[PDB]
Structures are given as structure tokens and as C-alpha cells.
Amino acid sequence: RFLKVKNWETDVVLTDTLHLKSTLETGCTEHICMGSIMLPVRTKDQLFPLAKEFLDQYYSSIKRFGSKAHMDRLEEVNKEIESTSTYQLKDTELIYGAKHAWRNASRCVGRIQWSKLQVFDARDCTTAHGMFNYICNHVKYATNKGNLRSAITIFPQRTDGKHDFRVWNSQLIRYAGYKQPDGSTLGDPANVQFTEICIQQGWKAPRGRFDVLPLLLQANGNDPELFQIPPELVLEVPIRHPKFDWFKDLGLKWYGLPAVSNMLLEIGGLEFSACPFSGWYMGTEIGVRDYCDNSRYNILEEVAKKMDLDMRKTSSLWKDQALVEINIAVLYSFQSDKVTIVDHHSATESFIKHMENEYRCRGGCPADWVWIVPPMSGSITPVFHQEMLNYRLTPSFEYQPDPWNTHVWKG
Amino acid sequence: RFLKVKNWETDVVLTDTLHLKSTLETGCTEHICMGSIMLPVRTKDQLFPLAKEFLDQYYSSIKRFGSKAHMDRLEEVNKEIESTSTYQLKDTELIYGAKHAWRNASRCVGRIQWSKLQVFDARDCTTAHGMFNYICNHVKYATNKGNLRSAITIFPQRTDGKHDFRVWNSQLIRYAGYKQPDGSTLGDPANVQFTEICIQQGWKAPRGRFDVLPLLLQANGNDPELFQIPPELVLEVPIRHPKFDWFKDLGLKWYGLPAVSNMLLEIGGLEFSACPFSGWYMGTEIGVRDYCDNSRYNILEEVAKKMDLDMRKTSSLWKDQALVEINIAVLYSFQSDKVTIVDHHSATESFIKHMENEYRCRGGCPADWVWIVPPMSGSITPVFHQEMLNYRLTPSFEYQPDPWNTHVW
């Protein structure tokens, strides 16, 4: 079967065949679409088909499908599963697997970059201190003094689910949030719960607006341990505006390295519960979401006050005007400090070229429109006008619940 | 089977039970989501369960479910379908059905208004000339000198499908588009094909940038005929900016009355193929889509130039800056001329309030996030942060293909 998608701006029609390789469920049915819902141990039995499907994909990718090496590896993995109940990936397979999880990540607008990914194999890690060292090296490598390089660090896979490696932080670098007795929040309101956990675990909180959180690291199912990232490894950018000299005195800054650390990487049926990965920012992540969400730093009012906008009616579009200036400021600040960043126009235009290439060479590109369209100026980006098909391919990144909800405290 | 939707800004969680009454298919499956795809006669046998499902909901709405009058009407409609192959709605049922088609319109952000809809029953209409009169009266009533009022006009239902009433136009009021001898497009590029059909049917085109198209009306399955809406019934607004004196020199205008005329209204299995309806604009429709879509009036570049912005690099956000100014100018111009308009902040706030009402009083609210979130400033409106379930309830409005594909002349 063939599914078609149309671009309503160009009339370009693309044909998807890749969706035929999708196995997992979307949340949608013939009767209900869950496209805007954020959240819509294996037996030997379920594991070998998953392993075989992956190894088949891997061996096809290297043009060795059906070779003796391919058949030998199937046999090897089969024997390993029957005897030890799991199996280990070759380094080559792990690299291919991590690259493909990114390539398959339907919510990721940055996927033109997918084949350029530095994979740090941390499967020999055994302790939280060991995890800390690996994560420091990842941060330093990926940061590269502002010339950011995409990377992922992969810690040992799940075994019985009682020995999980987990990074408790949702991102390697984030700022603390402190709920005040008067109900106001200091710093990032998104990180209040996690900040409270770190404090409980013994973190001495500076209690300012931009305190870099410590890492909370769980190795081998043990209780998590606290570590502070060396400050000299945390590259930050003070935010200023090219025309407005008062913008700097808002006191804003942000970190240069966006690094997701709470997702689960599935490759060949194996589950990597700790697999922090990083790229570089699209400006709107910071200027639209982190700064302007009512739920986050919420700076729109203060910015519009300083611009002397007419704020007595929403129809002056004061929020929209202030929003644009804040995003100009973020991009300008990053560019001026020589820290990699991409604007939403550039990123979406590159995504469309990536997606067309994928349709030609792969027969599709699963994409989640709700996430791919930027949170400002949607329809002046080419992705707004592009029909997309969302489906789930493996290898994959999956959301997993926060560890504090499920962790068995050892004491 | 009982489903939750969470607002990620406020943490409010609502439980949807209404989706279990949903009937039609979405285009999605367990393997593939088609949420971003724009486009994802009845026999006696198919018609009666549709009639019954509708009449049950109707009698329930007026708290007379299972009453003698409920059973009597079901009986009456059954007899009528068996004997005549179709049936006629009572005026009360027609009004109820049209209001609920709007209530069920998952792509409509303006549904807080759904119960205030003026329904014009045009089922007695028999000719294209009659259609034109009804439409002028709708246009005049809905416009109301700029104080717009929501309205729908409902022409006769489909019979054997060879006698369809259709308005060939996609909206009652739209501007012509013409392909120019040097490859550019004058007017609205979206209307080039329809304008050619108008000219070849007789229309004398003025060949300007903002020529209101004539209506092409089809009655009783006949070949459509051309009528010009009286110019004095088409309220238009010159676009100016409150700060930029030069903005007026772009020579932009838009019409005040948005009136969708190409959809099919289904009520109780009955199909109203000509049912033009109108409300009032949300400003982004005009300022973001009509003016700034690359395939539409495409004015971003000219505005940005007049603002003297750095157009050399995307990262200066010149497109974004010009976009906001164009939308400020649309809203200002409508407001100054006392023509109803709503900004995207205000409209989305109202929709969230509407969703909460629908959840508490009805068990849910079908909504299509891809359409409901405005085409600019998505995440600074509250709908961006609201999970929505999309599902199809009847009575409904459905898109139908342009009739010039269907029509045999």
C-alpha cells in the first residue's frame, strides 16, 4: 500500500511506503485521533523476533543481508538469548541503532543531522561516579567551546528492571526552581519538584534565578547519587538585544547545551534506560517556551512593559510583539558569543529538504506535525503547510516515567 | 475507553466520555496518525438508523426522551422513509441540527457562540434566482452594518443526487485571481481556476487585485448560473496601521464577512449540499494566512522592505516582525471601522472556556489541535498547551469536492 502527503503551498505530493514497517501503536484508532496527546522486562519469546528484525535492518543497511556474517550473527544472538535471556550489541550495531533512533524520532525537526552523531559507549560503566565521569566527558566534547557537536552516551541496558541505570535529571543542564512561601517561584518553575529532591539528597542550593542543577545519577538500580558538573564545563550565554540596551538588565541567560537525559533508547528489543543525548538549540525553544510559557520564566509582561507597548488590550498584539523581540535577542546573543544555534526559519526549511530526501531514499519520514511546527510564527514556516504521517519505527527513543515515582529506595 | 485530556500549562485534567458516541472514521489507525492531513445516495436501510439516532438526541435535548411525542415522530419518520425513500425535518429539528453541526465542528475555535446561530430555512427555494435572493438577504442580515451576526441558510436536501443544490463558490465573498501574461498572478492566486470558470460562463472580469467574485449558483441539479452580489451589500475594510503612515499605500483591503459556502451539512442522514454559513473573522485568518501565505497575497517581503528590516538573514526574524505588524494593522482597521473581529488571544481564551463548559455539560468537546492553534504565536495562546481529542459527531459539516469535477453540463 501507498499513502500520499501533499504540501499545500507547493502542491508537491510525496508517497509513503515506509509506514508498512511500523509495528508499534500510535494511540489513535479509526474513531479517535490522539495526535495532540503528549503521552498517548521482555521474555526470550518476544526478544528474538525484535533482535532478528533489527539485525536484518542493520545487515541490509551495510549491504550484507543474507551473508554468512549476517546468518552467523543471527545464530550467535539466538544462542545468547536462549542461554542468558538477553544479548549484547556489537559496537557497530549500537552506533547504527542510536543513529536510527534519532532518524526515526518523529517529533525532531533537527533530523537532517541524524547521520552525524558521536556515540559514546558507556556500557562498561558500573557506578554513579563512573556515570558522572562519562557525562562530564560528553558535556565537554559536545560543547566544544561553543561549536556544538551532537552526541549520545549509552549506559548499560536493562536486565531484570531491578538494576536500571537512570539519569534522574530530565536534561543534563537545567536551572533550579524554588517555590516561595508566598506562592511565587524563583528560577525555573518546571524544575521545582526535582530541585526539592536534590535538596533532600543534600544539595546546598544557592537559591538564585539561574542555579545549574547537580546531576542525580542511578547506577545498577542503586539509590541515586549527587554530583555537581564542573562550572567551567557549563557554557552559558547572557541574553542581550541588538537594538534595546535595557534587555541585558532583565538579567537573562541560558545554557548553550540542550541535552535530553530522561528518555529510553530501544535497539533490537534491548532497553537503554540511561542514554543522554545532545544537539544544539533552535532559538524558539528558549525564547518562546523557556522564557515565555506562563508556566516557565514568564517574561512577556516585563519585556512588553519596557518596550512601552499598549497593554490594556490583547488586540494591540503586545504579547506577539514582545515575543518576537525576545527571540531576536536569544539568536543575537548566541551568534555573538559563537555558540551554535538555529533559527526556526532555517531549521524548518532544512527539515523539509531532509523529509523530501527521506521520501526518495527511504520511502518515508514519520513526522509529528504538532511538535515539528515551531511555537511561534507557525504558518510562515514551510512545515505548517506540509502534511505529515506519524508512525513509530524502531530503533526508537521513548518517554519513560520519572524515576522518583518508581524507584525502590534501598536506604 | 474513558479518556483524559490534560492542559500542560494549568494541570487541569478533563475526562472525555462523549467520544464513545462518535460514529464516523478519522483516517487514523493504530499504526498511523493522519492528524495533519487536510482531507483524511443513501438507501432506505441506511437512512432510518441515522434518522433515529438524530431524533433520539433531539428528543433527549428537549427532555422528552421516550415520550409519546418522541415515539410518534420516530413512527412518522419511519413511515415517511418507507413510502417516500426520504423524510423532511421539522423546523425545530432543522434549527437544532444546524446548531449542533457547528457545535460538533472540531476545527472551529469560535464554538462558544454555537447556540446563537440564526437559521434561514431556504428549503422552499426552487431556482438559482431564488438562491441569489436568499444569499443577499443572508449577507445583509449577517453583516448588520458591521455588527456581524452568525447565520446559516439551508437550501433543499439531496434527493437522488442528480438534483443537488450547490454554491460553486468556496465562500460567498472572495476576490478574483488572474494569471498574467508575464507569469505573475494578479488578485488572489487561490481563485484562479474559479475565476476562469466564471469568465467562461460569461462574467465580465474587471481584472483588478480585489474584484469580488460573482456567485455561481446551482439549483435542482441544473447548470449553475452567475449573479453579482449587490456591491453595497459587500462590506470591505481598507487596511491601515496605527503607527505606520505608509501602510495604507500598499492598497490592501479585505471583506468583513467570512462565509463558507462549499460544505455539506448532514442532519439525521439528510444531506444539505448548499448551506452557506457565516460568523466573523479571527484576525490571523486575514493577516497571517490570506496576506502572508506564499501562495496567497504573499506580502511579507513588501512590508519588511517598507519597515527597513535586515532581510539578508533569516535569523534577524524580519519575517516575524513584519508578520506581527500586518496583524496589528488588520485588527486596527476592522476595529476603527466598527466591523466585528476577534484577535487570536481572545478567541483561544474563549475556546478554552467553551471546552470546559462542554466537558462539564456534555462529557467532551471534539477538537482538532492542528486547526485550533492559530498560525502565529502558537504557544502564547492557551490552546497550544491543551490536549484535545479529535473525533467526528453528527450532525456535521463535511468538505465536499468542487462541483466542476462532479458536474455534467
Ligand code: HEM
Ligand atoms: C542537532 C541539532 C538538533 C536540533 C536543532 C533539534 C531540534 C529539536 C526540537 C526543537 C525538538 C522539540 C523539542 C521540544 O519541544 O522539547 C526535538 C525533539 C527531539 N529530538 Fe531533536 N534536535 C537536534 C538533535 C537531536 C539529537 C542528537 C537527538 C538524539 C540523538 C534528537 C532526538 C530528539 C528526540 C527523541 C525528540 C523528542 C523529545 C521528547 O519527546 O521530549 N535530537 N529536537
Ligand code: HEM
Ligand atoms: C462566530 C464567529 C466564528 C469564529 C470566530 C470562527 C472561527 C473559525 C476559524 C478561525 C476556523 C478555521 C478557519 C480556517 O483556518 O480556514 C473555523 C473553521 C470552521 N468553522 Fe468556525 N467560526 C465562527 C463561526 C462559525 C459558524 C457560524 C459555523 C457554522 C455554522 C462555523 C463552522 C466552522 C467549520 C465547519 C470550520 C472548518 C471549516 C473548514 O473545514 O474549512 N464557524 N472557524
Ligand SMILES: Cc1cc(N)nc(C[C@@H]2CNC[C@@H]2OCCNCC(F)(F)c2ccccc2)c1
Ligand atoms: C510529557 C513530556 C513528554 C515528552 N515526550 N517530552 C517531554 C519534555 C518536554 C517537551 N517539550 C519541552 C520539554 O522538553 C525539554 C527538553 N527540550 C529538548 C532539548 F532542548 F533538550 C533538546 C535536546 C537535544 C536537542 C535539541 C533540543 C515531556
Ligand SMILES: Cc1cc(N)nc(C[C@@H]2CNC[C@@H]2OCCNCC(F)(F)c2ccccc2)c1
Ligand atoms: C482542502 C480544504 C479542506 C477544508 N475542510 N477546508 C478548506 C478551506 C481552507 C481551510 N483554511 C483556509 C481555507 O478556508 C477558507 C475559509 N476560511 C474560514 C472562513 F474564513 F470562511 C470563516 C467562516 C466562518 C467563520 C470564520 C471564518 C480546504
Ligand SMILES: C[C@H](O)[C@H](O)[C@H]1CNc2nc(N)[nH]c(=O)c2N1
Ligand atoms: C498539548 C500539546 O500536544 C502540547 O502542548 C505540545 C504541543 N506541541 C509541542 N511541540 C514541541 N516541539 N514541544 C512541546 O512541548 C509541545 N507541546
Ligand SMILES: C[C@H](O)[C@H](O)[C@H]1CNc2nc(N)[nH]c(=O)c2N1
Ligand atoms: C498540512 C496542514 O494540515 C495544513 O497546513 C493546515 C494546518 N492547520 C490549519 N489550521 C487552520 N485553522 N486552517 C488551515 O487551513 C490549516 N492548514
Ligand SMILES: [Zn+2]
Ligand atoms: Zn491521529
